[PDB]
Design a protein around this ligand. Structure first.
Ligand SMILES: O=C1Cc2ccc(Br)cc2N1
Length: 119
């Protein structure tokens, strides 16, 4: 029932994500001058280095907040891809599935730890 365990679990999951070839387009912020369609359609840019930096700064209070930012990477990618005919689309779908598969136990364990704390 460790309330703090999620943080190292998220650090390790981000390490797996960065090693995966599918994360390459999502590792760093998009240059808004080079990709103006992203600039116009994306209200809140997000990328995995910003997620990792936020986590390391101690600026996430829960893994649910980290999960919201990672999900934003994928929803921004979906808004950017008008069809299935681009590698960004293919990579985003697979990386999202991998992330969701691995974050589920992190969220379950954290929510269980909070319920135990408040029991
Ligand atoms: O390097 C790039 C250019 C680019 C455009 C749009 C999206 Br979503 C991700 C990325 N990554």
């Amino acid at each position: 029932y460790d309330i703090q365990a999620w943080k190292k679990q998220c650090e390790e999951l981000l390490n797996l994500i960065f090693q995966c070839e599918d994360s390459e387009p999502f590792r760093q912020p998009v240059d808004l001058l080079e990709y103006p369609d992203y600039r116009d359609i994306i209200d809140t840019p997000m990328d995995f280095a910003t997620v990792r930096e936020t986590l390391e700064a101690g600026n996430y209070e829960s893994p649910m907040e980290l999960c919201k930012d990672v999900r934003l990477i994928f929803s921004n990618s979906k808004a950017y891809t008008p069809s299935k005919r681009s590698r960004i689309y293919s990579m985003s779908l697979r990386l999202s599935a991998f992330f969701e598969e691995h974050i589920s136990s992190v969220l379950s364990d954290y929510k269980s730890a909070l319920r135990f704390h408040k029991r």
